[PDB]
Design a protein around this ligand. Structure first.
Ligand code: HEM
Ligand code: HEM
Ligand code: HEM
Ligand code: HEM
Ligand SMILES: O=P(O)(O)O[C@H]1[C@H](OP(=O)(O)O)[C@@H](OP(=O)(O)O)[C@H](OP(=O)(O)O)[C@@H](OP(=O)(O)O)[C@H]1OP(=O)(O)O
Lengths: 146, 141, 141, 146
């Protein structure tokens, strides 16, 4: 993914002020709610019968901290996203059996969450930057599928 | 199908949009052009720079179209009937871009409504915008 | 919306697909699994090795579902009520995959029925498989 | 893209048996018939209001040949599809205003056509190899859009 140097700047600058535990639960929570079929991979989490059930759901909260933390690892290696997530890619494929298209759905939910949280600060070019990032992460996680 | 809560949810979210129509709609188009440049292939005749008059007036048109849709959420295929004609016979836009714009609309509502964009409203808007895309692309073939 | 011509093109072209329904459906499953490996994620409990009995088994159920749909081309949403309930609440397959399978069913019919796979029948079957998928993803949310 | 030798082997072989004056017109023709909104870019070719009109149209066959000619250039330079289609990418984009999504549709229509021209010879693994090829091509043509 080609992030213009200023896009690189924007991504890293907006991310340095992100509450990773708050954004993760929120993003995974909303993916579960907006595209409820994604809940198929989480019948081990408990109650997910209502928007509130999800967003409050401690498993969903805890797990999201994991997803986004891994995500942060990618943001520190925009140069090599495939290698960064290669281990996770094999796991999602072989062990978790997750359609990679779900990665794209989440990437766009994460963008909606970042906009929600940052408001006007999430300018159109900042979105544009992050659209590349989430696409790059999604492609990176799909890379070891077979 | 839009559940009862979907219609209520969208009505309250869209209402809060208020008179910021051509503003939100123009931001959404601009977000879409910058984030998915391929969508620009359809506006070659447009001045797509920041805050141009064409986008502004066009953003107002999309925003009003969505406002009408919300007021006619029970019978969207009838209200958007004329629009479905345009996009299907003249504009001939590829159905893939409809998703790109809905997403940019979601992001604009998210970035302007810190209180109204709950997970539930978010879920209901996405559904709503996907139903409008479905209609605008019904007559393609 | 499937026009009169479309319905005839399908009933007519799907006729030959009749006998070999099990060979065609399984071949379309194989082509999908090979041309688009992410689709395999939905069959982890399956033996996807070529010539597998499950693939052939399930291949016939899909073809037989498509034969039934063709027969009730005018009552598509209801004729598939229980199959859409399945996909939506139990299988929960991401809608993008249906497109992948559909293209593979078209390749499979192209390869077997050169006489009947005319540009027009090609278009009609595409519209047919597209709506079949629309019905199967209708109760997702 | 990333074609193994058995893949570059499978592809090159089948392609040689391709009717250079029939497959191109056929793919492009069916594109306009199955996805009529694509007729928009060829209103200068005349009658396209019907399957026999579009198919039997001479500009459709003659232009489809040009298109297949370009594709041939791809099945030789798989290692660098971008440079090969760079110029075309810039043309379609800057002067032709063609939504690169149409490159994806045409690629899949080509596969249907190859399947139709070769029957049983167009086995699933030869298809798979050709899916990577047309994906690579549409991607390389979309590469200079902006
Ligand atoms: C931004 C993209 C994503 C990242 C970076 C990511 C990362 C990870 C991480 C770190 C784990 C924990 C691995 C372990 O338990 O050892 C994980 C587990 C999991 N992920 Fe993802 N993931 C992503 C997207 C998704 C999506 C979209 C789904 C499917 C909706 C998903 C489904 C799962 C599941 C099921 C688990 C196993 C959870 C469990 O412990 O029960 N992930 N993912
Ligand atoms: C969210 C759904 C969308 C709605 C509700 C919508 C609504 C409209 C409306 C109202 C018009 C103005 C019609 C008129 O009075 O002449 C229009 C025009 C147009 N739309 Fe859409 N549109 C949507 C999505 C898109 C997308 C996906 C594209 C393509 C990227 C598209 C491309 C255009 C173009 C090219 C025009 C003509 C602009 C001009 O020359 O004035 N629209 N749309
Ligand atoms: C053309 C559209 C499709 C048709 C008409 C179709 C039809 C069917 C039918 C009839 C069943 C059997 C259910 C029963 O026993 O009552 C089924 C099962 C299933 N379908 Fe689909 N399906 C379609 C697309 C897909 C796609 C895209 C996927 C995802 C790659 C998918 C994944 C499955 C799976 C996992 C099963 C369960 C297999 C098993 O346990 O035997 N289907 N499908
Ligand atoms: C397989 C991908 C494609 C390839 C390899 C390709 C290649 C070409 C080539 C070689 C030309 C000649 C331009 C010149 O003289 O330098 C051309 C022209 C053109 N292509 Fe494509 N093209 C592709 C896909 C498409 C698609 C999908 C469309 C859209 C439906 C399209 C629309 C056009 C148009 C409109 C022209 C202008 C011809 C005219 O009207 O005079 N192309 N293409
Ligand atoms: O080795 P990489 O840096 O990852 O780059 C290559 C490729 O370019 P090269 O093969 O010529 O190095 C493209 O990189 P970009 O120019 O787009 O950044 C890209 O192909 P696309 O045109 O499909 O974008 C593709 O993968 P991706 O696009 O997902 O980064 C990736 O190929 P590999 O990862 O297979 O080596």
């Amino acid at each position: 993914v080609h992030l213009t140097p200023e896009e690189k700047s924007a991504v890293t600058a907006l991310w340095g002020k992100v509450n990773v535990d708050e954004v993760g639960g929120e993003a995974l929570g909303r993916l579960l709610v907006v595209y409820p079929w994604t809940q198929r991979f989480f019948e081990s989490f408990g109650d997910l019968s209502t928007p509130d059930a999800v967003m409050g759901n401690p498993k969903v909260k805890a797990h999201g901290k994991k997803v986004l933390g891994a995500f942060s690892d990618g943001l520190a290696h925009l140069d090599n996203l495939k290698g960064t997530f290669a281990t996770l890619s094999e796991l999602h494929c072989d062990k978790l059996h997750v359609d990679p298209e779900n990665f794209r759905l989440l990437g766009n939910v994460l963008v909606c969450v970042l906009a929600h949280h940052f408001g006007k600060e999430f300018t159109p070019p900042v979105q544009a930057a992050y659209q590349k990032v989430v696409a790059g992460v999604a492609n990176a996680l799909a890379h070891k599928y077979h | 199908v839009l559940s009862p809560a979907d219609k209520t949810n969208v009505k309250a979210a869209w209402g809060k949009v208020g008179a910021h129509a051509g503003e939100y709609g123009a931001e959404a188009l601009e977000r879409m052009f910058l984030s998915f440049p391929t969508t620009k292939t359809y506006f070659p005749h447009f001045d797509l720079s920041h805050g141009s008059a064409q986008v502004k007036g066009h953003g107002k048109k999309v925003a009003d179209a969505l406002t009408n849709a919300v007021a006619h959420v029970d019978d969207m295929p009838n209200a958007l009937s004329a629009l479905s004609d345009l996009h299907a016979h003249k504009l001939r836009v590829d159905p893939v871009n409809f998703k790109l714009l809905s997403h940019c609309l979601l992001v604009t509502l998210a970035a302007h409504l810190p209180a109204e964009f709950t997970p539930a409203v978010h879920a209901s808007l996405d559904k709503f915008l996907a139903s409008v895309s479905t209609v605008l692309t019904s007559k393609y073939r």
